[PDB]
Design an enzyme around this catalytic site. Structure first.
Site: not given
Ligand SMILES: [Zn+2]
Ligand SMILES: [Cl-]
Ligand SMILES: [Cl-]
Ligand SMILES: [Zn+2]
Lengths: 402, 400
Positions: A59, A61, A248, A302
């Protein structure tokens, strides 16, 4: 003319608990033996240290990474984080951000990941009325240019909420049409204010393009557990067992434990997968409990160096150390569980488990470490020695040589 | 003119880039540009230059004892304090002076490679270790003076009232030259809060040394024990001469118990140390700092039967604290940076000579990052380490 394209000598293999030579032809592991005889083009000597499958950062971005950089202090971090603020920051940013800036960030992020031995990632990408498909376009372009370094799945991500920014639905459809691999939203309850609607809409879109789902659920406590339970039940109703990840699930940390206990069978029945990111895993997240109950729980960065998270080195071994501190783990067994989290759990989350691992017939995607074992790697944080993707050497002594 | 010049040094306290001129062990000049050239120069290239980091709590005596196999030794079983105590008594039975001295030196080398120039180590004193560990530590200390400054706490690891030989041995340890004295868990180890604390003060005063107490006890029994410590600090005329290590109880005791106690801690000058190998996620670090409490930071144990982790790296420790405590703002990362620098200095009592200012000690670290915040974030290796105005580390090698 030669028996092997690449041989890694003297490789400690944690799953077998012994040292072997590894013989590779093309992008495949062909042979694992205490000693390999035969002609070989290239060799790497691991010198008795651990060799691991490539790490999995389940995960990220990549689209908006490194946007906090360029000054003496990180940009944006004069103020504390809240989700809704970081959303407004993102809409301001994407107003004028260029295709080339975004592609550059994605490539920089990937380079940082591969240098640390991550060979597989699943990035989210912002889709909303301001970003439109500009970020998606740049990510898919970079992805193609990075295919010899790192395998990337792309989640079309409705960052603002389907029921908050009403353009999201059309834009996500387009993003999927363009080639995004998964679809996802954010906080069915506290962002969307419409749990049933948001989830039903995500499944509708998913099914139209025959893609898997990765949902951002930050919501804490019982509203979080409720929302994942609704997601899981809908997963069964839609014939989507095994096709859904919840990212999450912070709520598992503060909801009453009996709520998680009641929901575990539902998660197993739905094949629900989870990702905990080491940039936010709550200290009381029941990681070991989930793993012992047989729940698939991967791990991830993240965001890296942006208006959501100022941290990030794209390093899963550093992430594994961070988890042991968050969660207060020490035993060899527990460190071993964290190691599975950044490797084979991630593979399962991504759906690549059949081709993932250091076994004959699997992909020759490997990391030679400078430490003796998973436990000693987490502890010592030694730099990677070599990285191998598709049976070719791509990193050697802290440089990308691909 | 200058023995050493550091060029193009970003200084966080002044928020600008300067040349730093050094003569002997002293910083002599800080200027936008120092005219002229000297033999020995280091170019920081606009990156951060910091005072040396302060690792305010270690166990150098028994470090690296988990090493030597494929998996860490000892860690097939979960930690508890009393089991780790037994492991230590078993280990010190046959451990040799040379093995212990070697581990201390290894530990120091690891610390200085990461820019830690000041540490306070505890050393086990009990009926099995006797003063064997003390001896070795003091001996290494003397050999390491060009690398790192070491304070040594004579540490009654087993409890004054559990191992009855502790008192005589700790007196000897002080006589031999330990700088501080301390015990463990007045309540749950000793089962005698007043007794243990009074004894520690008696011994302290006999040898005119400071106190550093291990108080792991959680909740209200921890707060109670630190309160008794702080009151006795005032009674004994020991204001400013007592540190409490860990104080994990601040994390789980009712916040009104800490609120009530803060003026007592300020009145007694009580200092604290939170170690990044155990700081509870709900420890009220920022609250303590904003209330003006002195709170240093530390490794604690490195690669032994207490803690399997450790790289002796305070910058990595600072990143660990931000994750334990869930911090992100530039202000909060700044606070963690003070913890590993000037808060530590104050804990150790060296603040007058600590800092990058004219007249202070030339004990410095040239980083490969732009700022305290960026250094915590990027974890870049150190470029250069300087102790007493002499280059001791360059590009991951000790060159002293
Ligand atoms: Zn995220
Ligand atoms: Cl856990
Ligand atoms: Cl010099
Ligand atoms: Zn300690």
């Amino acid at each position: 003319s030669k028996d092997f394209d690449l041989i890694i000598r003297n490789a400690y293999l944690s799953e077998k608990d012994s040292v072997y030579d590894i013989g590779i032809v093309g992008d495949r592991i062909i042979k694992i033996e205490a000693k390999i005889e035969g002609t070989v083009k290239d060799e790497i000597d691991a010198k008795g240290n651990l060799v691991s499958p490539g790490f999995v950062d389940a995960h990220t971005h990549m689209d908006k990474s490194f946007t906090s950089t360029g000054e003496r202090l990180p940009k944006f971090w004069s103020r504390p984080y809240t989700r809704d603020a970081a959303i407004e920051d993102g809409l301001k940013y994407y107003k004028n951000a260029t295709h080339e800036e975004i592609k550059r960030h994605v490539i920089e992020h990937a380079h940082m990941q591969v240098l640390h031995g991550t060979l597989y990632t699943r990035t989210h990408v912002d889709v909303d009325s301001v970003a439109k498909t500009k970020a998606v376009e740049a990510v898919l372009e970079a992805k193609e240019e990075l295919k010899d370094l790192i395998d990337i799945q792309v989640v079309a991500f409705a960052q603002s909420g389907f029921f908050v920014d009403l353009e999201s639905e059309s834009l996500i459809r387009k993003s999927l049409d363009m080639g995004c691999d998964l679809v996802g939203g954010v906080d069915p309850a506290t962002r969307e204010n419409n749990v049933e609607g948001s989830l039903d809409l995500c499944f509708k879109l998913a099914k139209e393009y025959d893609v898997d789902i990765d949902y951002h659920i930050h919501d804490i406590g019982t509203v979080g557990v409720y929302s994942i339970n609704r997601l899981a039940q809908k997963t069964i109703e839609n014939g989507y067992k095994g096709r859904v990840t919840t990212s999450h699930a912070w709520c598992f940390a503060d909801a009453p434990s009996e709520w998680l206990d009641e929901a575990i069978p539902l998660y197993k029945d739905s094949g629900m997968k989870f990702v905990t990111c080491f940039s936010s895993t709550p200290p009381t997240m029941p990681v070991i409990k989930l793993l012992e109950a047989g729940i698939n729980l991967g791990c991830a960065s993240d965001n890296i160096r942006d208006f959501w998270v100022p941290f990030g080195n794209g390093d899963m071994v550093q992430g594994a150390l961070i988890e042991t501190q968050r969660l207060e783990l020490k035993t060899n067994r527990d460190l071993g569980l964290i190691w599975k989290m950044i490797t084979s759990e991630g593979a399962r989350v991504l759906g690549i488990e059949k081709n993932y691992g250091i076994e004959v017939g699997k992909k020759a995607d490997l990391v030679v470490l400078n430490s003796l074992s998973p436990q000693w790697a987490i502890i010592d944080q030694a730099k990677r020695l070599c990285v191998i993707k598709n049976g070719r050497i791509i990193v050697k002594d802290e440089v990308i040589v691909a």
